[PDB]
Write a protein that binds this DNA or RNA. Structure first.
Lengths: 63, 60
DNA sequence: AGGAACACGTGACCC
DNA sequence: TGGGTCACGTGTTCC
């Protein structure tokens, strides 16, 4: 009769996983590009590239 | 015998988790509000802060 | 104590 | 087929 807590915990865990996927999809929809499907890691990797690149170019544009 | 196979699979799986985590850390290092932080932020916050940061940039 | 974030191992599916 | 990602349920850690 502890199924209730397990079930609830499963619901809670799923909600985090889903928020996480939602955030990933949003990062990806924001990258210069772009051609899905990148997998999650690729989205992250390409997000990193974008910020380093924007940093470089943006810095360069002065001094 | 094919117990090795299952452990192989579960190792592949850990390699991916570890890679994503490092990417999350690396991303956080690139978002100033996260960077400025003593306590490590959780993974969802880091993602939320990173998209926030990106909407910040397009406004120049 | 107990929940939120995190880590794990495995079944379903894919190329 | 091999070997990879993903969603899941549940074990582990931390506050």
């Amino acid at each position: 009769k502890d199924k209730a807590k397990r079930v609830s915990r499963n619901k809670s865990e799923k909600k985090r996983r889903d928020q996480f996927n939602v955030l990933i999809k949003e990062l990806g929809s924001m990258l210069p590009g772009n051609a899905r499907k990148m997998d999650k890691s690729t989205v992250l990797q390409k997000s990193i590239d974008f910020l380093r690149k924007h940093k470089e170019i943006t810095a360069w544009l002065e001094h | 015998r094919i117990k090795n196979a299952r452990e192989a699979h579960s190792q592949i799986e850990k390699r991916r988790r570890d890679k994503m985590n490092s990417f999350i850390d690396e991303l956080a290092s690139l978002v100033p509000t996260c960077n400025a932080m003593s306590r490590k932020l959780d993974k969802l916050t880091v993602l939320r802060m990173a998209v926030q940061h990106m909407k910040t940039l397009r406004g120049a």
